[PDB]
Design a protein around this nucleic acid. Structure first.
Lengths: 147, 50, 107, 153, 60
RNA sequence: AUUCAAACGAGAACUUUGAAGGCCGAAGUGGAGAAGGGUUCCAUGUGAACAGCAGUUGAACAUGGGUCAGUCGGUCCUGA
RNA sequence: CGCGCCGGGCCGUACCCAUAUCCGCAGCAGGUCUCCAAGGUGAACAGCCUCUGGCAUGUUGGAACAAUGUAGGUAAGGGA
């Protein structure tokens, strides 16, 4: 698991462009053109009852929030406003991210595309989850022994 | 060896009586330079020949 | 006030997780000893032999997940030391662990 | 005997010497340099922490290969270690030195180490066995330690 | 103290390996001054040292 | 592939005892011999040096002890 | 043939016999002739587990679990 030849002979130094072992990760990166699919709204209290149907769409209309079953693994539960970005973004869980407006004029039809979500998958990520909500889950399992 | 000859056994007897330290009172003698026995043989280091 | 005894349930499983086979049981006796020095703030911790036997009951690899113990903090007797108090950890045989709080036994 | 440095006022000072102490010279010179100027009660407390790894000894000169510790930042240094034996040897010499202050009739809680010297002693002879039937020396490097305390208000 | 003279002597009097010799841990100071097979046999009668039973190897 | 407690001790990861967990697994890490070693055997004591950490231990060191034959061998016989 | 009487000298004899008492400069993964040989599985003196007996992991521990190693493994689809 090495690099066989580092450099030639007569440039008697090893150059800076040769691959060497060292730190990997925890680098500062900036990747661009991450589209915002949905600016979610946090939990709020209203008339005594609270409102949490964040992951509700115009086609799902379910009372489920953005939180999957069992909360986000290694993070917790998102009770504030959130933003939904397409694809992966840099960093680990809980890692603070900086969201900067684009430096470039977006004049491609990819960048000008309108988004209307149809379904937000809130199954459990802490395993091979197979239920969107708890109301759906116990309606399928039926009653259990602990009842 | 457990099977010995009388020549050998008598020989090992001598090399055993010589392995003792010098008595304490000899370096109280007047013209005494001896500090300790320089011919102490240890059975594991020096192998006595034979 | 300071001479107290109380039951505890130590979750050995979450204090052994990761360590190798030939070290799981010995590490359990260290994590128990560290557990006592946290609750009863005494460096001198003496664990009972029957508790040792309870940890090595399943061999060196497989170590009981939970274990019930009685931490009793006593006055250090003669053999004068800076340690004026020591903690004697004792094993408590229990059938199940469900709904087992850290009760405060008394004498 | 003949000390490397003579106290300016011998009436206000006590000495202590050690010869052929089987303890690493390089480790002892470093722990002696850290103990040098401090008050005696501060010294014993420090040396006891070195044995417990609550305070390190900054390895200034003999530092090749010596690892980095977080406690060396208290000395404005990067490399430090916790030489247990080296600390407990000259923890006894402090015990012997302040014992001399008691005998000389000095105020022990005002003593300040001001001279502490570590010299090399004659090396001892052992041997190790290398490949291809060779024998290499296995010397120990003991040391002479002599310190001088003085009362300073 | 150190009791390896006694555990060897006890094994030889009991005609059993020192694997099976039990020296009472509470009464070390009385077994320490045995020094003799005659005094060892006295510790047999007093029950201070016991020949442990054979480890079970049930054939059931 | 070790762990707990105790004892001794100035001092214990290493000694000793007890308990536990393991290994050798009868072609043995067991019990005895030949050759070779030559006192290493055993007891008491010490901890300078030595036992590539340590040691309250040792095959180290210092004192003393220990090998009993008509029948077991040698001795006798001849072999190359 | 039965019984009775007398005599049998000299030398060896402890211990180790081997991952520490021998030879390899050493408490060296090497080398060095033999005897005795339990239960289960099984064709079996195989391998694996155990009892009798023995031992303390082989000249150190502790804490971590990076890269490179060393020794074990497993890999979608393809199959040299």
């Amino acid at each position: 698991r090495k690099v066989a030849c580092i450099g030639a002979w007569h440039p008697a130094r090893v150059a800076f462009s040769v691959a060497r072992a060292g730190q990997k990760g925890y680098h500062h990166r900036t990747e661009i053109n991450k589209k915002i699919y949905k600016i979610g709204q946090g939990y709020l209290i209203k008339d005594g009852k609270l409102i949490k149907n964040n992951a509700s769409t115009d086609y799902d209309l379910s009372d489920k929030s953005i939180n999957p079953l069992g909360g986000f693994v290694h993070y917790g539960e998102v009770t504030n406003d959130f933003v939904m970005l397409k694809g992966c973004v840099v960093g680990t869980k809980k890692r603070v991210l900086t969201l900067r407006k684009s430096l470039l004029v977006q004049t491609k039809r990819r960048a000008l595309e309108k988004i209307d979500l149809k379904f937000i998958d809130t199954t459990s990520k802490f395993g091979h989850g197979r239920f969107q909500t708890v109301e759906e889950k116990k309606a399928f399992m039926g009653p259990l022994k602990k009842d | 060896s457990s099977h010995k000859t009388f020549r050998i056994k008598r020989f090992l007897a001598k090399k055993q009586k010589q392995n003792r330290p010098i008595p304490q009172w000899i370096w109280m003698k007047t013209g005494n330079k001896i500090r300790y026995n320089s011919k102490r043989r240890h059975w594991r280091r020096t192998k006595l020949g034979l | 006030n300071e001479v107290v005894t109380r039951e505890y349930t130590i979750n050995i499983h979450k204090r052994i997780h990761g360590v190798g086979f030939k070290k799981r049981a010995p590490r359990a006796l260290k994590e128990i000893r560290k557990f006592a020095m946290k609750e009863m703030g005494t460096p001198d911790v003496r664990i009972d032999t029957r508790l040792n036997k309870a940890v090595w009951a399943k061999g060196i690899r497989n170590v009981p997940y939970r274990i019930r113990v009685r931490l009793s903090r006593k006055r250090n007797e003669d053999e004068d030391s800076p340690n004026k108090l020591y903690t004697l950890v004792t094993y408590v045989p229990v059938t199940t662990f469900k709904n087992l709080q850290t009760v405060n036994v008394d004498e | 005997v003949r000390y490397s440095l003579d106290p300016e006022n011998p009436t206000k000072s006590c000495k202590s010497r050690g010869s052929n102490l089987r303890v690493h010279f390089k480790n002892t010179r470093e722990t002696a340099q850290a103990i040098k100027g401090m008050h005696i009660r501060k010294a014993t407390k420090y040396l006891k922490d070195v044995t417990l790894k609550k305070q390190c000894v900054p390895f200034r000169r003999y530092n090749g290969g010596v690892g980095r510790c977080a406690q060396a930042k208290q000395w404005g240094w990067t490399q430090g270690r916790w030489p247990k034996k080296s600390a407990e040897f000259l923890l006894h010499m402090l015990k012997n030195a302040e014992s001399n202050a008691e005998l000389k009739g000095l105020d022990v809680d005002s003593l300040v180490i001001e001279h502490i010297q570590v010299n090399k002693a004659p090396k001892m002879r052992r041997r190790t066995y290398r490949a291809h039937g060779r024998i290499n020396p296995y010397m120990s490097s003991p040391c002479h330690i002599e310190m001088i305390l003085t009362e300073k208000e | 103290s150190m009791l390896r003279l006694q555990k060897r002597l006890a094994s030889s009097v009991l005609r059993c390996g020192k694997k099976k010799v039990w020296l009472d841990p509470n009464e070390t100071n009385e077994i320490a001054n045995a020094n003799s097979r005659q005094q060892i046999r006295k510790l047999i009668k007093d029950g201070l040292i016991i020949r442990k039973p054979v480890t079970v190897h049930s054939r059931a």
